[PDB]
Structure formats: C-alpha cells, structure tokens
C-alpha cells in the first residue's frame, strides 16, 4: 500500500473519470428525453451504457494484473442546459477531454516501461477517434439545424447507427453491456 | 422552483440512493471477482445492473409526470472487506435499508394524497420482498459454509437463478438493461 | 490554413502516395492482362482495389479528425516492362517503399505526441508485413520459373488466396471495396 | 509505334479523362462527407466507382483489339467548394462534358470507318442519358432546397436509387466494381 | 550471415524460449495426468498446444520478413514436483517471465526503429495479460483449496473456459492448432 | 527408482526420439516454407503434428501402466539444406530409423516377456509401413522432377492425401492432434 506506479494511479483516476462521464451522459440523455428529443435521448442512453463498459474494462484490466482497484464515487454532473446545442457541446468537450486522458495514460505507460498498459490503451485510442468524430458531427448538424430541432432528430434517426461491437474490445468486468 | 412536494423531493433522493446502491453492488462484485469467487461476482454484477434499472425507473416516473429530475453524483462506496461474509452482510443491510426507503416513499405518497406515486411504488415493494429473501439466503448459506468458500460458490451456481424479467415492471428511462 | 502538424502533412502526402500506388498496380495488371497472364492480372487488379481502399482509409481518418483533406492528382506510372519479372520487381520495390512510408508516418506521429495517429498507423504496419511477404514470394517464384511463365501462373492459381477481409480494418471513406 | 488511328488516340485520351472524372467524383464525395451530407456523399462514392468502371471498360476494349493502352496519371481535381450546390454544378458540367467526349469518340469512329469502335461506343451514349438526367435533377432539387440542405438529403435518400447493373454493359478490365 | 539486427537475434531466442515453454507445459500436464487431476491436465495440454502456436507465429513472422529462422532444440524441463501447487507456481513464474521477454522484444524493436516488429509484438502483449491473470487465479485457488485437490479440480471444470480463438491473432506457420 | 525394465527404459528413450523427430519435421517444413514449396511445407507440418501425437501415445502408455515418464528436452535438429531433395532424403532416413527403433522396442518387449508392451507396439509397426512408403515415394518423385520443383509440388497436391485417422490408434495423452 504505497508502491503504486504512476500507471496504476492514473488508471484508478481514469476509472473515476469514466464513471463520471457515463453519469454525465445519462444526465444529457435525460435532458433530451425531457425536451422530447427521443432520438437524441436514445443515442445518449446508449453512450452512457458504453462509457460504463469502458470503465468496466479499466476495472477488468486492473483485476487481471492483480492491481488494487476501488470503485469510486461519482462527481455531480451538469443537468441544466439552455438549449440542446449546449448539451451536444458539453458532450463534444467531454469526448475531447477523454481523448487527452487516454493519451496521457498511454504516455505514462510508455514512460514507466509498462508495455502491458500501453498495449491495453491502444483500443481506447481507436474508440476515441470514432466517438469524437460522431460528436463533432452532431454539433455541426445542430448548428445547421439551428432553431429547427426536428431536422436534428431526423438526421440522428437516419444517419446515426448503432454498430454491434466489433471484436477486439478488451473484456469488461461483468461482461459488456 | 420551490413548490416541490414531499413526494417529488423524496423521489429525487431515492434516485440518488439507487445510483449509490448500484455503485456499491459493483464494488462488491469487483471485490468478489478479485477473491476468485466468479459465481458471487457474476450475481452481484447482475444486481448492480438491476439496481441501475431501478434508478432509471424512478427517473422515468419523474419524466412522465413532467417533474424536475436531476441525475446526481454518487457517494463513495465501500471496497475493503475482511472476508466475503462481511460483503454479503453489507448487501443484506443495503437491501433492508432500501425496503425502508421504499416504504417511506409509499407512506409519503399516501400522506400527500399522491395516488399516482403510491401506485407506482407498489412494484418496488414487491421486488424488495424477493431481493431481501435472496440476500438473506446468501448470508445464511455463507455462515453455513464458513471458511469453505467453495460450497458457497456451488450453492450460488446451482440455486441462484437469473429470472427473465416478468412483465409489469414500470418502464425504465433508456430501456431496461 | 498553415498550422498543419507534421503528421497531417505527411498523411496528405501518403494519400497521394497510395492513390499513385493503386494506379501503378492497375498499370501492372493491365500489362499482365495483355501478356495473357490472367492469374497475375487478376491478382494485381485485386491489389489495385485494395490499395485504393487504403487511400480511402487515410482519407477517412482525416475526415474523422476534422482535418483538411484534399483528393490529389496521380503521377504518371510505369506501363512498359521488358518481361513479367521486371513488373513483379517493381511491385516488390513499391511494397517495400510503402513499408518505409508507413514507418515514417508512425515515427512522425510518435514524435509529435499524436497518439491517435500512431494507433491508427498500426493496422497498416500489420498489412505491410503480409503484402511484402507475398510480393517477395512472387518474385522468387518468377525467378524459379524463368522463361516458363506457365509455372508462374499455376503457382498463382493454386497458392495465392484472396482472403476475405479480417475485422479490425479501419473504416474506409465510401466503404471498403 | 506511330501508326495510331485517330480512334485509338482518342480512346487513350478518354481513358485519361475517365480516370480524372472518377477522381473528381471522389473529391466531391469527400467534400460532401465533410459537410455532413452522408446521402450525397454515398451517392458520389458510388459515382466515382462507376466512373472507374467506365475507364476500365475503355481499357478492356483496347486490350481486346490488341491496341496499345497505357494507364495514365490523373490531373489534380477541385476540392474547394463554397456551397454544396457549386459541387453539384461541377458534377453536372462534368457529365455534360463526358457526353460531348463520347459523342466525339463516336464521330471519330464513324469517320475512320472503325465499326467496332462505333458499336462499342453505343453503350456509353446510353449511360450518358441517364447520368445527365440524374445530375440535372440533383441540381434543380438543390436550387429548390436552397439554404435548407436537409431537404436535399431527404430527396436523395428517398428518390435516388442504386440500380443493379443491367446486362449489356461491356466487360471491364478486372471485373466491374 | 552476421548482419543480424538485435530484433532478429532476440526473436530467434524467443522461438527457442517458446518451444521450451511449450515443452514445460507438456511436462506439467503429464504430471497432473499422473496425479489424477484430469481437469488440470486437460487445461495444461491446451496450454502446451497454444504455446506451440505462439512459437509458430514467431517463426511465421521471420518467414514473412525473409529473415533467417532456425528450429531450435529444447532444453530439458522440470518433471518432478512435490505437490500440484508447486507446478502451478512454476507455470505462473513462466508466464511472468514470458511477459518480460515479450516486453524486452518490444523495447528492442522500438530501439532499432523496427516498426514491423513492434506492431507484431502487440498481440503477444495482449495475450500475456490474460494468461498471467489465469495462472495467478489458479495459484490463489490452489492455496485456498490446500490439501483438498478435489475443490481445485472443480473450480477448473466450472470456471476455466477454453475460448475459441478471437480474430486478430497473427498467422502461425503451419496453421494454428 | 532403479528397478526399471529394459522396455521402460527403451520407451523413455523413444519418447525422446519421437519429440526430436517431430521437431526435425518442423524444421523441414519451415525450410520448405521458406523455399516457396507450400505443398511440401503443408505436408511436413502435418507430419510434425502426427509425430508429436506418436510421442504422446508413448507417454500415455507409460501413464496407463503407472510407469515413471519424463518429458525430455529435444536435440538440436538440422535446418540447412542445399536442395529440397536433401531434406526429403533426411526425412526418409528418419522414417527408416524410426522403423528400426520400433522394431527394437518390439524385440525388447518380447524378450522381457512384456506382453502389454508388445501388443502396444504393433500399431506403430503398422504406421511405419505407410509412412516409409510415402517418404520413399516423395524421394523418387523428387529425383524424377530434378531441377523442376513445380512438378514435385504438383505431385504432392494431387496425390498425397491426408487421411482422417483410422480407428485403432492408441489414445494419446492430451488427445490426438
């Protein structure tokens, strides 16, 4: 209790960050749900679930290496939004922050010579590319729609496709939801 | 912002309590997972998911009545346990506390004359009976097994059965996981 | 317009290189086609298509990161060959050059601290191993066949197998052909 | 090397033109892709592929007549557009230019008394009618939609139908993609 | 014969190490077989086969890069064990040593600027995480079982699951067994 | 430890010999693989696997009689060959040597009055007939082909048939691969 490597410490923080991110995505979906944007709400419920899966993957990685892992609390998240665009903006900012965090985790792994950690990080880097692309798309399409939220909903219904999970995902503690 | 009924306030607290309970169940499952009790860990991963569903149901109820609902933070939960029995004890104590909370919610609904709330509460009362029974079973079987954790795992594998959800559950925001 | 990172610049050059490589593969296939080596021609038509897919993947990567991407021209390629071996040699030299280019792209990604780029590059490294192996095989088998082109064609028909794409390929702009 | 008929020369130029046209269609699709007009982008990715097929057909025709054929470079194409309409306009202008080119090829065939060439040209004339009609439709529908790009996308999704290739197409070198 | 890179040399040593590891796993399985622990013996026969596959993958990698590869001898392995736990301990120590070896191979690849080698190593890093986790589980469960070997066998039968190979494995010389 | 019968001792040596033979077959297959003789390489990968099975059968026989059995090391094998014929010659010489070894094992069994051993040996005698016949065929066909290795490969592809294992094989420790 005390000889924790930087990578171990950073991974525990990332588990906190991921659970917090999942909760923020839930808050955003509920906000959309209560503005009668079901398509957006459905998409973000899915996102909350997948963020939860990511946290479980970090947990599972710590279990597999027999490193001490704790399930954290969750910070309060944001529920007030003036307009749907502001919540899509928050989600884009969150995805970009997650990209930075995973990059920092990779860098710390490489610095400590923790090869296992570095390899494990690679899949998250890959997921981040696609996630950020989709959130940026949603933000741009929201700007184009402006006041007309129905067009935004129609774009989401036609163009935003739930993909069944590719293989290659790391195993999540408790199985991937 | 301010004319919130007691039932509305209490339901928002219950949403906080349920999310916290789900997180505590996750912590317990991870603890079991890292003690190599896969059967117990699998059961409690399921329990965490179902507690999450319950919180979503409370959320959905507030959405359906157009009452203000906020997704809360989550308190830190307990991760240290000296022995598996102590974690099964924590889970039993939590289920009993939840029974009290749902009973208090029912009582507050009845007091305010909120019939909709009272009816909605009924399903949770029903779920509590079965949940508490199962946790109490697990605690008694852990005592009987004592030091021999393999028997506990074998009991769980043979006797503890995931049931597909009966009908009659209230709808959960974002669909039941 | 001007703050382009080295990785962005290098990726745009690689898009030019890949389209050029696809066109050179087409030229080689047409050359084989007109020497009545259908098996070789069929193989290299496939190769041209797969190089095109690779270019589309680089394009898609730039789209996903919202980086400016331009579809380039294509340099003139080589059409004259004295003998089929000389064209298989050109193809081997091209595959090796591509290996260098992808390695340089990886190195530039690592240097700029562009983790997303580095991860994305990994799949191309992997494809290069197999591609170079197969081209080197074709060159050695051409030497062994010498003047007797029928044996070369028979080797290709029996031993060179189109594999359906494994999973794990990055997504190509416009879908993988 | 030097006794090339006008039809042979013109066909080699047309192969250059077709490859250039395919690349321009790719540039247009990528432009649409990066403006979040997936339906338009999908349509033009298809168009790029079909232009490539056309070039391959011209190649195959030269192979079948044992006429010298070279795979050319590709001119740089246009990537900047101020607004989607301007790119649909470019595509319409390109289809009309292609109609002129194929007509000139037919006329040159008839002039040299190259019956084989003339017959072969007929299928391209036929394809041009339909292609120009569709591009002109897209331009008119873009004008009607004006600023509202969502309507344009909806028109494309409902009304623009990929048809499986009719029979009667000439064979393409390397098989029709 | 003499300009061998460090990565080439280290890979040849790793091929020796992997074949030796496979043979040691066979010795362990035979030891379990002759102590009437069929479930453990079955698991370790599988492990021996999969270690053999790993060696074949390293071989295939050297074949694909046209690097000189030799099939080595195999060192004598350990057959005497005082108690099954001591053999599970040997297997855990071996898996950890393999993790170090693959990490050293990765580091040497990165040092020489051998990108192909580094990418190829990644899959082995990933396999090591899971393998070490499972061996550590077996050791802990053996300690918990103590003198009672039947519980150990029962844990293995219920909880240790042969997974069909995921995709993404590198190709093994002679096909994966 | 010391009252080992001649048959027991000889069987342990044979286990060493068989593992060595399997490794030599692997070396030969890899040699063929790296000369681009896939059909020969495939055949000898199969042979290596079947030699491994034979060693496992000898192991299993010692397990069934509760005789002490040790998994041995493996001698270094030959990897250099000047020409494919020289490796087919090595394989023929090895199969003939194995025939002698199994005959000596039978003779020693008969001498010690070990009926169980003698009966068990019979299946190996039978396998040797067919194996030697096939290797001798390959050598003669290689001589007939001479410099023209393609004919050798074609003979192997058409005439050398993997047969599913007949019944009557003795059981192999860890199941027959």
Numbering used by the authors:
A (entry chain W), B (entry chain D), C (entry chain H), D (entry chain G), E (entry chain M), F (entry chain A): 5 to 181
Paste lines from the article.
Ferritins are protein complexes that are involved in iron homeostasis and DNA repair by storing iron in cage-like structures. This protein complex is formed by 12 or 24 subunits with tetrahedral 23-symmetric or octahedral 432-symmetric arrangements, depending on the subfamily to which it belongs. Here, a straightforward expression and purification protocol is presented that provides an apoferritin, bacterioferritin B (BfrB), from Mycobacterium tuberculosis with high yield and purity. Similar to as in S. coelicolor bacterioferritin, Fe2+ enters BfrB from the B-pore and is converted to Fe3+ at the ferroxidase centres.
Part of this region was ambiguous in previous crystal structures but could be built within the cryo-EM map. The C-terminal region 164–181 consists of a flexible part (Cflex, 164–173) and a rigid part (Crigid, 174–181), as described by Khare et al.. We found the extension of the C-terminal end to be located within the interior of the BfrB cage, which is remarkable as Mt-enc has been reported to encapsulate BfrB via this C-terminal extension. Our EM map displays well defined density for Crigid, residues 174–181, including a double conformation of residue His175. We placed water molecules here, as we lack experimental evidence for these water molecules being ions.
